[PDB]
Design an enzyme around this catalytic site. Structure first.
Site, PDB file in Angstrom:
ATOM      1  N   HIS A  48       0.822  -1.210   0.000  1.00 25.13           N
ATOM      2  CA  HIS A  48       0.000   0.000   0.000  1.00 25.13           C
ATOM      3  C   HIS A  48       0.848   1.248   0.000  1.00 25.13           C
ATOM      4  O   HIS A  48       2.011   1.214   0.378  1.00 25.13           O
ATOM      5  CB  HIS A  48      -0.875   0.050   1.278  1.00 25.13           C
ATOM      6  CG  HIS A  48      -0.090   0.312   2.544  1.00 25.13           C
ATOM      7  ND1 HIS A  48       0.745  -0.651   3.090  1.00 25.13           N
ATOM      8  CD2 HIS A  48      -0.032   1.426   3.315  1.00 25.13           C
ATOM      9  CE1 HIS A  48       1.285  -0.092   4.159  1.00 25.13           C
ATOM     10  NE2 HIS A  48       0.861   1.168   4.326  1.00 25.13           N
ATOM     11  N   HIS A  52       4.809   0.112   0.028  1.00 29.43           N
ATOM     12  CA  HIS A  52       5.568  -0.673   1.006  1.00 29.43           C
ATOM     13  C   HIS A  52       4.725  -1.750   1.598  1.00 29.43           C
ATOM     14  O   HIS A  52       3.498  -1.658   1.575  1.00 29.43           O
ATOM     15  CB  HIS A  52       6.192   0.217   2.120  1.00 29.43           C
ATOM     16  CG  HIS A  52       5.217   1.148   2.780  1.00 29.43           C
ATOM     17  ND1 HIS A  52       4.777   2.295   2.153  1.00 29.43           N
ATOM     18  CD2 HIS A  52       4.610   1.050   3.978  1.00 29.43           C
ATOM     19  CE1 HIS A  52       3.915   2.851   2.984  1.00 29.43           C
ATOM     20  NE2 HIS A  52       3.782   2.134   4.094  1.00 29.43           N
TER      21      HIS A  52
HETATM   22 ZN   LIG Z   1       2.168   2.599   5.454  1.00 26.71          ZN
END
Ligand SMILES: [Zn+2]
Ligand SMILES: CN(C)CCc1cccc(C2CCN(CCc3cnn(-c4nccc5c(=O)[nH]cnc45)c3)CC2)c1
Ligand SMILES: [Zn+2]
EC number: 1.14.11.66
Length: 335
Positions: free
Chosen positions: A172, A260
Site C-alpha cells: 500500500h 511498502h
Molecule cells: Zn504505510
C-alpha cells in the site's frame, strides 16, 4: 541523486535531528525519496521515553487476527477483529510456544520461513491503537505533534502497533499519497519491502492482472491493504524493489506514492502517523482513492501554496504531470 533508487540510511547529529521538516528536506535533496522508503537512525543520546515498563495495562481496543490465503507468492489477508486485550495479554501470547519467532541464523532464513508459513497459524496484530509512547517534554521528531503543513487540515494523530512474529502489513501507499513516519519503540525488528514511486504504476498493473475481480470492484483495491506479494513474484515479473530491516530505536520514512509492505520478527511496538511537505500537495490532488476511505479536501492546500493554479485546478484545466525524482521545494538550502 540516488539513480539506483535504493533505500538510504541517515545518521543525523543532535543539531541536524532537532528540526524534523528541515531534515526531511535534507534527505530529499540526497534523493532518499526515490526509493520511496528511507531509514533515519537518531543520535544515541536521544530517547522518546525513559522506560517501557508502565504499559502492561495499556488497552489494545481492536486486536486483529490475520488470516492469509494464497499460493505461489500471491496472498490475500483477511482481518478478524478480536475483543480488546492488554499489552500484558498480548506479550504473553506473542512470546508463547504457539506464536514465538522460530530459531534462525541470518535474516534471509527468517524471510524464507515467513513466506513459507504466512498462511499457517494466524497471528494476532495489536494494530491501529490510538496513542503515543512519547513523553510530554520530547520536542524532536514527536510523532504526536510533528507540526508539518498537514496541520492545515484521524490523519494527524498517532497510532501504536504491537506486533508478533509473522504479523504483516500488505502492499500500500499512504492515504492521500502522504508521507509517514514509523518509530520502532522496542522489541524485535520489522522488515520492509519498498517499490520506488517511479515504478508504483508497474506494481498496480501487476496486482490488477492477478486480482482482476478486486480491481473491477474498486479502482484502488491495494488501498484495502489486503494484498501480499513475495519478493520472488516481484522479481519474476520485473517489478523493481528493495528491502530493509528496521531495528528498535530507528525511524522509517515513507514518501508520497511509495508502495511498502512487510512483517514483524516478533514482539515489538511501533508508533506511526502521516505528514506532509510542499511536494505532497500535487500527490494529494492527483491521488487515486478507494471507491468502497480517508479523504482530505485539497482546496485549503491549493489556496495557500498554489494560489495562481487554484482557478485552473477548480475548473479541471490543471493537468501537471508529477516528477517522482524531484525533491521538495524546501530542499533548496541543501542544493
Ligand atoms: Zn504505510
Ligand atoms: C485508521 C486506519 C489505519 N490507518 C493506518 C493505515 C496504515 C498506513 N500505513 N500503514 C503501515 N505502514 C507501514 C508499516 C505498518 C506496520 O508496521 N503496521 C501496520 N501498518 C503499517 C498502516 C490510520 C487510520
Ligand atoms: Zn475500495
Amino acid at each position: 541523486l540516488n539513480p539506483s533508487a535504493r533505500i538510504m540510511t541517515f545518521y543525523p547529529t543532535m543539531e541536524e535531528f532537532r528540526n524534523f521538516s528541515r531534515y526531511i528536506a535534507y534527505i530529499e535533496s540526497q534523493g532518499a525519496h526515490r526509493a520511496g522508503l528511507a531509514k533515519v537512525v537518531p543520535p544515541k543520546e536521544w530517547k522518546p521515553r525513559a522506560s517501557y515498563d508502565d504499559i502492561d495495562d495499556l488497552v489494545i481496543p481492536a486486536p486483529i487476527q490475520q488470516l492469509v490465503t494464497g499460493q505461489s507468492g500471491l496472498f490475500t489477508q483477511y482481518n478478524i477483529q478480536k475483543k480488546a486485550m492488554t499489552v500484558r495479554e498480548f506479550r504473553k501470547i506473542a512470546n508463547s510456544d504457539k506464536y514465538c519467532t522460530p530459531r534462525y541464523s541470518e535474516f534471509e532464513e527468517l524471510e524464507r520461513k515467513y513466506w513459507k508459513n504466512l498462511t499457517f497459524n494466524p497471528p494476532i496484530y495489536g494494530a491501529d491503537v490510538n496513542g503515543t509512547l512519547y513523553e510530554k517534554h520530547v520536542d524532536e521528531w514527536n510523532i504526536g505533534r510533528l507540526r508539518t503543513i498537514l496541520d492545515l487540515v484521524g490523519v494527524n494523530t498517532p497510532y501504536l502497533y504491537f506486533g508478533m512474529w509473522k504479523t504483516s502489513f500488505a502492499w500500500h501507499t499512504e492515504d492521500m499519497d502522504l508521507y509517514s513516519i514509523n518509530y520502532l519503540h522496542f522489541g524485535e525488528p520489522k522488515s520492509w519491502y519498498s517499490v520506488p514511486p517511479e515504478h508504483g504504476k508497474r506494481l498496480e498493473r501487476l496486482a490488477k492482472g492477478f486480482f482482476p475481480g478486486s480491481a473491477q470492484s474498486c479502482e484502488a483495491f491495494l488501498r484495502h491493504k489486503m494484498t501480499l506479494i513475495s519478493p520472488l513474484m516481484l522479481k519474476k515479473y520485473g517489478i523493481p524493489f528493495d528491502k530493509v530491516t528496521q531495528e528498535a530505536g530507528e525511524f522509517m520514512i515513507t514518501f508520497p506514492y511509495g508502495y511498502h509492505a512487510g512483517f514483524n520478527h516478533g514482539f515489538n511496538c511501533a508508533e506511526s502517523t502521516n505528514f506532509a511537505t510542499r511536494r505532497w500537495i500535487e500527490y494529494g490532488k492527483q491521488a487515486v482513492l478507494c471507491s468502497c476511505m480517508v479523504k482530505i479536501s485539497m482546496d485549503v492546500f491549493v489556496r495557500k501554496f498554489q494560489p495562481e493554479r487554484y482557478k485552473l485546478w477548480k475548473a479541471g484545466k490543471d493537468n501537471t504531470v508529477i516528477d517522482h525524482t524531484l525533491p521538495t521545494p524546501e530542499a533548496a538550502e541543501f542544493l
